[PDB]
Design a protein around this ligand. Structure first.
Ligand SMILES: Clc1ccc(C2=CSC3=NCCN23)cc1
Ligand SMILES: Clc1ccc(C2=CSC3=NCCN23)cc1
Ligand SMILES: Clc1ccc(C2=CSC3=NCCN23)cc1
Lengths: 281, 281, 281
């Protein structure tokens, strides 16, 4: 199924019939970072399998729901169960849920992910406000927009220079300062590694030479689809490890260590994003 | 349809029956840079849709013609309507028209494109004679030659060290000096960004570190297919903007600004390439 | 056909019925470097076309056999006729023979390849023990593991930091010292160029900046599939040329020069790997 105007419209019509919520804000949460979705007020849960034209996610399994409701007095829509390109999903499958958000009225998209640290200042448990990216799949002819352009949504050749909104970054930092955890918050450039193997030690050393601060396997495809159709983005990485220190010391990484860092920071991240939602313009 | 010897032969046979021209020179022109095609003498226009085994271009639409005729007393064939890989065309679709040129007798291919400047010496409106390239799709398993080798056309493992002919570069520069616009002409290395998003600010900074002078979304696939089958190439970029200055100043880019630069330089480029065609060995 | 547990099991069952060999060691040899396979004792030759679920290799042609038998008193299985991703084989086709090795009992995989030298210390005819890699296809969403994870074989997110076993590297070096050819043996980082074009002169200069020692078009996909399922790896490059010197001097390369270097070093490499097999733990 193509992520075109007709197919996105059919999905949006179903959601409006079931939900009664017109959301202004969309959220996509990283693994182990989804507690906020469970606290959405007056919520409505819509399994992806119920929605016309949503991608099929049964080969990978696990949860897959849209959740609509209220947080801090604002109307929101969340993806619970994220689609990643290393799983084999196509460009069209990644893009269709974001374009449905657009048709439902979303103007701001908030995103979190787990990432490896490249900048020497970064420690396990730190946060990075993403200010730009290096898209290795895009340079190499696997951009999420390869294919015919869907002109109803945006232009053939988008400019990404303002993909990461400056004022949203400033608001996130302001809340951290108000609550005395600004020492955990950095800004940086995110490198997209298609995955699913972690960056090798010598790949990490290369990324340090090229001016990357963090590296991960998500986020950039959704940012590009949002920017193409005029949705503002805030994206925050939680640092699982420093890959440069690990390379210099011959130390390993695994999904278990990543998820333990996620559990340590989950409650703070939930509170931070609730406050951002409450206050964003 | 595969870009093999039998399929290219059927297309070439049709063209020879309709056209009566055996061309020595092929041209592919960048967007807004096609005026020369409209001045071809004794011309014959052959829509792609009429030619056996030519790729289907109706999803993207717009013009798609082969034009044969004379320029400066030389016999030429032009592609009017270029195929780009960010549109979703396959390796085989890009390659078949160049291999048909080979079977028609083409020995030299002249190419223009619009590009972003990375080298700090480059200004909007400058020209760059391409002397080499950095092929990010090729390094990343999306080379135009991935697939079975078509042995009738060239070798399994081509060498690209002489893909950009030195004497053709010298002749282009000589004509610029004769007519007092050599101050606009540079030489440089072209980075292939698969696209269709413009290079991000942080991607531009990376390309500066890696020794690239210009960046764009075309040209390298056609150069590789031509080199594989023994066709000499001259490739010239028109600089739409300096992406490094734009990153340092927080300034944006769009297809409209690009096309305005193309209109400013269109007549000079037409005259330059007419003179190159007249004089090349 | 997917490289899953059921499909690999059917292939392994056929091989055990025909062969009577349970191998501990697997080998994959570079082009012109396969003499050792011809010296396997008490050997059994099984064409790929005879084995359930093995990939179809008739479009490319040439040899394609599994060979089982004894070398130096150890039980081995060799791939005679290597599958390369520049030929158009999919992720699943590359992976299935390595996963069949796993099910047959292989614990160690030995690999050779032909490569271009980037480090200035490297000369034609030198050997490089690979200690790490830079996987441009992997960074760019063409990793061999893109797709559903086959959980019976390994984890969703593998760590590659110990993909190249340290003790196997030490043993290879020890044998070279015992026989007075250690002056030919280096260690280094391997860059994977998807191919099939040789690295361009300006790509070679980029790889020098990024800390690569050698560049080639194979090996990394098989290393990743082996590491994912717990097989230890030794990988050795034979240097055909120095691509940096060739770029500075305007000198070319071709498959013929590569194969002449292979013929010069073939007998030494056969003797070296026979001794490694005899002595590895
Ligand atoms: Cl991350 C964060 C965000 C907000 C607070 C806070 C201090 S007072 C108060 N009334 C409701 C929220 N709130 C603390 C931490
Ligand atoms: Cl780009 C260019 C190329 C040629 C000329 C020129 C000066 S005299 C003359 N007779 C015909 C062409 N021609 C000027 C500019
Ligand atoms: Cl590459 C290599 C490997 C081994 C030797 C060697 C010296 S004595 C001896 N008995 C059998 C093998 N062998 C020489 C060269």
């Amino acid at each position: 199924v193509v992520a075109n105007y007709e197919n996105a419209s059919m999905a949006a019509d179903y959601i409006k019939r079931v939900s009664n919520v017109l959301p202004d804000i969309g959220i996509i949460c990283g693994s182990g970072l989804g507690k906020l979705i469970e606290e959405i007020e007056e919520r409505k849960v819509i399994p992806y399998i119920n929605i016309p034209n949503f991608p099929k996610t049964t080969v990978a399994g696990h949860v897959g729901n849209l959740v609509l409701g209220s947080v801090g007095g604002r109307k929101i829509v969340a993806m619970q169960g994220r689609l990643h390109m290393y799983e084999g999903y196509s460009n069209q499958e990644i893009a269709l849920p974001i374009r449905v958000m657009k048709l439902l009225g979303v103007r701001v998209l908030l995103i979190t992910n787990l990432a490896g640290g490249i900048n020497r200042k970064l420690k396990s448990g730190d946060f990075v406000l993403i200010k730009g990216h290096i898209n290795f799949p895009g340079l190499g002819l696997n951009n999420v927009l390869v294919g015919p352009n869907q002109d109803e949504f945006g232009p053939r050749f988008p400019d990404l220079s303002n993909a990461y909104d400056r004022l949203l970054q400033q608001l996130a930092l302001k809340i951290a300062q108000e609550n005395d955890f600004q020492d955990l918050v950095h800004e940086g450039v995110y490198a997209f590694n298609g995955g699913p193997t972690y960056e090798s030690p010598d790949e990490s050393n290369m990324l340090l030479k090229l001016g990357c601060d963090v590296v991960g396997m998500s986020t950039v495809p959704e940012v590009i689809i949002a920017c193409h159709c005029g949705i503002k983005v805030l994206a925050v990485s939680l640092i699982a490890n420093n890959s440069i220190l690990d390379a210099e010391n011959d130390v390993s990484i695994n999904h278990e260590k990543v998820l333990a860092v996620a559990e340590k920071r989950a409650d703070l991240l939930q509170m931070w994003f609730k406050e951002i939602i409450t206050r964003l313009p």
